Write a protein that binds this ligand. Sequence first.
Ligand SMILES: CCCCCCCCCCCCCCCCCC(=O)OC[C@H](COP(=O)(O)OCCN)OC(=O)CCCCCCCCCCCCCCCCC
Ligand SMILES: CCCCCCCCCCCCO[C@@H]1O[C@H](CO)[C@@H](O[C@H]2O[C@H](CO)[C@@H](O)[C@H](O)[C@H]2O)[C@H](O)[C@H]1O
Ligand SMILES: CCCCCCCCCCCCO[C@@H]1O[C@H](CO)[C@@H](O[C@H]2O[C@H](CO)[C@@H](O)[C@H](O)[C@H]2O)[C@H](O)[C@H]1O
Ligand SMILES: CCCCCCCCCCCCO[C@@H]1O[C@H](CO)[C@@H](O[C@H]2O[C@H](CO)[C@@H](O)[C@H](O)[C@H]2O)[C@H](O)[C@H]1O
Lengths: 347, 97, 174, 97, 318, 83, 48, 171, 115
Amino acid sequence: MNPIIFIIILLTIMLGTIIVMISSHWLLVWIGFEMNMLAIIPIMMKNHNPRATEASTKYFLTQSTASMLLMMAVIINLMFSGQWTVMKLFNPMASMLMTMALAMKLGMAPFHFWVPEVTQGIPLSSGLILLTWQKLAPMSVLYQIFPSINLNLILTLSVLSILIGGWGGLNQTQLRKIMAYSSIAHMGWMTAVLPYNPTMTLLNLIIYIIMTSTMFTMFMANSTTTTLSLSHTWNKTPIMTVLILATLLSMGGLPPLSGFMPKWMIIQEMTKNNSIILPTFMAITALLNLYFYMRLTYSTTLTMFPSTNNMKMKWQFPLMKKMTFLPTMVVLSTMMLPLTPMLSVLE
Amino acid sequence: PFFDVQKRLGVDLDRWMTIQSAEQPHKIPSRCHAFEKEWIECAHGIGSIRAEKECKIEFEDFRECLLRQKTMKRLHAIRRQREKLIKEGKYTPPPHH
Amino acid sequence: MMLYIVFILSVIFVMGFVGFSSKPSPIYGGLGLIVSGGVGCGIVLNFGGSFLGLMVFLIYLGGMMVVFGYTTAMATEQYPEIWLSNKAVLGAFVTGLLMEFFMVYYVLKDKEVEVVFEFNGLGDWVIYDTGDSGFFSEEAMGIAALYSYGTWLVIVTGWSLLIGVVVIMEITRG
Amino acid sequence: MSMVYMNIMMAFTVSLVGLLMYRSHLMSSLLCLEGMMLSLFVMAALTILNSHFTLASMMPIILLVFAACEAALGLSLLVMVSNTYGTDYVQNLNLLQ
Amino acid sequence: MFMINILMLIIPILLAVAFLTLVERKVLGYMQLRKGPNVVGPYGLLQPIADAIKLFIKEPLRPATSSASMFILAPIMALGLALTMWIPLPMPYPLINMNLGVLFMLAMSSLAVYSILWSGWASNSKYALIGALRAVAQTISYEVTLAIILLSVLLMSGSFTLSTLITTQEQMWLILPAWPLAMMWFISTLAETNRAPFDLTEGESELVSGFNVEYAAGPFALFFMAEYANIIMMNIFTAILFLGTSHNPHMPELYTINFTIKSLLLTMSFLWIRASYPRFRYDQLMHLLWKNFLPLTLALCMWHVSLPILTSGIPPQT
Amino acid sequence: AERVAAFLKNVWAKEPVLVASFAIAGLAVILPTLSPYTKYSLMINRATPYNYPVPLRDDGNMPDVPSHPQDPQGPSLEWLKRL
Amino acid sequence: SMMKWNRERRRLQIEDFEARIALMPLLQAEKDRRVLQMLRENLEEEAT
Amino acid sequence: PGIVELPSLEDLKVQEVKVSSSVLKAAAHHYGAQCDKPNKEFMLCRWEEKDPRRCLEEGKLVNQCALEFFRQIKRHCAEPFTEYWTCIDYSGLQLFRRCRKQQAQFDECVLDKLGWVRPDLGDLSKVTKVKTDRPLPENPYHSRARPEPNPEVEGDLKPARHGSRLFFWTM
Amino acid sequence: MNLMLALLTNFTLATLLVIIAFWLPQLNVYSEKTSPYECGFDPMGSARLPFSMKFFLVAITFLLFDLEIALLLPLPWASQTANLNTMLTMALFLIILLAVSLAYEWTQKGLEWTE
Ligand SMILES: CCCCCCCCCCCCCCCCCC(=O)OC[C@H](COP(=O)(O)OCCN)OC(=O)CCCCCCCCCCCCCCCCC
Ligand SMILES: CCCCCCCCCCCCO[C@@H]1O[C@H](CO)[C@@H](O[C@H]2O[C@H](CO)[C@@H](O)[C@H](O)[C@H]2O)[C@H](O)[C@H]1O
Ligand SMILES: CCCCCCCCCCCCO[C@@H]1O[C@H](CO)[C@@H](O[C@H]2O[C@H](CO)[C@@H](O)[C@H](O)[C@H]2O)[C@H](O)[C@H]1O
Ligand SMILES: CCCCCCCCCCCCO[C@@H]1O[C@H](CO)[C@@H](O[C@H]2O[C@H](CO)[C@@H](O)[C@H](O)[C@H]2O)[C@H](O)[C@H]1O
């Protein structure tokens, strides 16, 4: 891939997301989704190996099916309303189809099976796009149709995502599958608060993106994709292990780290609506996420695993990866709890 | 939209196609033009929570124009009865019907 | 009987879908899809969309022609499967036709049928517009407005088609 | 609703079940995807034509344009899957278990 | 009176096709310094009848490995669709007056391709398969260029109605303002009809007989009839598209006379071209269309979009 | 101007088909700007009456609106009669 | 030549379009009466 | 939901202009000039009332002026007019351009006898004013009273009292 | 109706000719006569074996080009718009982007058949 071609394709991925976000017409929203899927597959196939081919095919089949259900909902909405405006849907069957269509696009459980596999099959840079940028467009549509979403359906997906994400991460030794299951679990929190306060869905989304972007950027820096490969970081870049520790604890929602904020704010919103059993269940089940974050901090930062002799050759060479924005993202990933009231800007 | 860049910049990218009461080529009106306009003008500015309740009449009529469900039920009721009366030798259609 | 023209075409429409949804050899799946495109064009034509109908037929005829070529290269086996050659294909094919027949039988037996949702079986002509005396086609004016009104739609569609060429070449350059 | 909708909606459902219930050939599933667009195209056209909403008469055309892109995208992936395993069978795409 | 009209269309077509085979054999004979049929009937006039009778009393064959239903279906589509291509032709009055006759013929011509694909495939023999996939290649070559060539011409006519092409050319043939398009259209019709130098799906010297190598007797005859009916129809369409005949509503026969002469001469030129050139290689046909005709057709399409506007010559919708 | 001529003449010898295409494509883009007739195309499209000309309710102060189709007031198509 | 003929055809189209405009008031009046008569006929049959 | 009010069959009866479309097309241009005033008032009524029942009376004056128009042609120009629409009737598209010679004969006949002048190209497509005594309809859409708008939130914007007031935060 | 009548007659005549062709001639069917043809010697393998497509990339590009015509075919109607300034710009825009896509595939050797 010619560098100019990569930029144009990369700009098209953003263009499709932006089209969804600025569109007031259901057709243009669907077009934006198609444009996004068209441009992301070549990024997935960038390295041209059988695994990347499998991931791209599994991704394409899933996203195509969601687009069909989404467009079906739009046409049903047109029959029962005669209009195309992006807003609440006027038919409950259309609401179900759109909600499920967006659930597949996000990778929410039980439409989650593709997220672990696609993420594992593609490079880290592509996985970063998949688990962060690709969340924006479906969430922005959910942010506009939520008044007509069936409450039981959306909360059922949120609960299942948190459980399935929590349990799925416990068995993983690959860093890309850990980030996939962690992503599934975090998506559950975003949609659980969606019916009550959409602002806290945006807050959780932004903070999830900052923390996920930081973790992928640190994995890219040392070119690590397994738990054991990451366990050598202490012997080359000690500073990196400390940043991984702080970021991982934040992702686990431990105060006083930034990652505690979205969980804190979502519990507040749910209790204000006399929803007590669900936030309690959610917070406890999120302890599964913390458990398999803590294993990574054990093998990465708090202990020292054995090295290999050839590691000494890497002591003589500096990191040359861009690590774009890493110093800023890690500070935002960890030291933002004192600034929590700034969430009103999202209002 | 999520980001209303269209309103901010004043450009009009897709609002033109959103409703059937908007300006059409050569002013060809849609079949339910009047019903849409009434519902859009009833609910303008007051929000969906209020509009769901205070514009049911306008919406209910508009829905009838779109899918004609009440009308077709009425015709099936009339047609079904004629079958009963024609088949019983009770009513006879006039020449023009 | 002729008043039910659109319904009769829609019955063949579903039957074509059962043809390729049962998933025999893609040679026969393509045939099923060509039929559905044909009577699908007929359905849209009978609603006043001659241009829309003929084009979906034209586009799908070229698409299945590419599919036929790809089937002989990448989706062919020694004994391509017909609807009668496989129990899973025949079972799906039979199931879809019986589910189609019964829906037809009730809606014709009663002039209404309930299949999850209420459908009126009075014939599709009853919903048509009564008056009409414009000296033009409405579909043509609406479609032709893509270039005056649909400036934004042309940009996004033109870009996507251009990117599509760039993308397919990246994907297929191993 | 009108009776045509019953069969067009049924057609979409048949292809949806067709897509979700795989066999071996990945090509067969790509046809079920083109089947769903065909029914979506037809059902959109009936609604738009019947209601006399002129400006959306271009909507079904745009629908086909982005169906062609998906089919071209799907066929491209099938080329690379076939070049790897020598068939388009979907059971070969299980490295990532 | 409409059924009689249908028979007055298709029976003469089958007679014209029968005698086109005689005219082809004679014209090629004399261009090859020989005579061609002149024994069976005076000047070979009974030769087409003898060939027709002989084929339909010859034994048909169903190959052992063939797919029966598609094997028989394919020749029926071929002849059925070939005759369907004639119903919208204004001669000067069409049998069926369509708003979109031009697009109807594009759709039917695309459908007629499958009578080649399915006959070659259903035959389940290698030479048949090779011929069938050449048909796939040939359609990919010309279909995109053919439609855009038509669109450029219709931008001067303003309509998709075939009868409006008669009105557009009332003062002058469209070949004057569009001879570059007429050139590329004429080639495209040779490719579209699998005619030499683009007779590739059959390609005698390479594929024995190509897509219909396994067909015999009557089923073979239907394919042969369909081919020659398509030759005449596409030259009528060329004559209507570029050599418009003036129509007098009170003397419609005079249109039909001048119109027929032009179509005969254009059909004669197909035979003339067959006697003159070697065959293309079928990847060279793809490059001819995509690398030469397509860039020029795209440019002329923009030119003919702009020209009516900049000259204020936009035609009417009617 | 000499470097371009060598390239231009070179492509006339190797790819005359592409030289002709770009030239025609260039004319399709430029001439509409420089043509004195392009303005009339929109006026003729404007003057074609697809719809009924709905009358206006006369209120008393419409000097330029005609009362009868043959009255002098209103747009005239004399420019088109002579075009 | 194509320019000049197509200008004439546009002039001929307007003339044709103006004839329809002249008759539209008469046809519209007939249409209104015809629709109302049909409905009134429908209404009476429905009563019995 | 009400019983649709439909007029009586006597209130709908009128003398019908029972001539073919080729007859109407032949006389359309002169008919447009001669019967403009009743026609324009009737068309103003339909696009204002939006109801065929509210315009019946003006729709009868359209026919009475059409019959009077065709009665004058019969009195003075029956034969020249009869050739002309016959020529129009022959054409499959009823084209004017195929009957220019006969159109002339009818055109100078109505000029000499009746003083009628043919409208120029573009005349019949003008938007014209029309005086009427029918009052302007006030609720032609039969709209209900619209819901009241939400009471406006206005006044002077002051800082939030004690800031965000989020848990412990003092700002 | 007329069109449906015309189509039925066309395919009815074709089917009648096939029926006559199959039931009029005297038949003598045996295995060697109906065996697959291949120049006198038995076929070597199945004709259902995969047949590689060398123009596969052109075939996919045809699907994308074959939809440009649907977008361009409305042009004769679009030329009747009042807003010709916007028209001509958008019509020329589409064709140029189609030309650019063709140039890209051409310059990147996408139209060359694989060996
Ligand atoms: C104020 C409001 C906000 C409140 C939220 C909490 C704020 C803290 C958030 C921290 C954000 C991450 C930034 C942490 C900076 C860590 C700097 C450091 O520890 O020294 C790095 C040291 C490098 O070792 P060296 O080889 O000598 O130097 C190479 C680099 N030039 O590395 C090492 O050599 C150490 C290797 C052994 C690993 C020891 C692990 C246990 C000690 C970790 C302490 C940091 C814990 C951070 C976790 C969050 C704590 C709240
Ligand atoms: C995943 C498979 C997807 C398959 C999709 C199949 C087609 C789906 C059709 C969706 C439209 C069905 O529409 C469903 O039935 C009728 C439609 O009048 C409605 O019927 C009901 O709702 C309306 C509400 O005013 C009233 O008539 C009344 O309350 C009741 O009749 C339902 O409220 C609607 O939800
Ligand atoms: C990579 C992207 C490539 C994008 C390329 C886009 C190329 C577009 C080139 C401009 C095409 C239109 O160019 C423009 O056409 C209109 C005519 O319609 C002309 O406009 C002229 O005619 C119109 C009506 O026809 C009159 O209303 C107007 O008074 C007059 O100026 C403009 O003078 C000309 O500048
Ligand atoms: C707006 C419509 C009209 C504009 C024209 C649009 C289509 C433009 C087509 C691309 C033109 C430039 O791109 C093309 O790239 C290839 C590189 O492989 C060049 O070079 C190649 O072409 C020719 C034919 O294939 C070969 O003989 C040559 O060996 C090879 O180098 C072509 O000479 C050039 O024409």
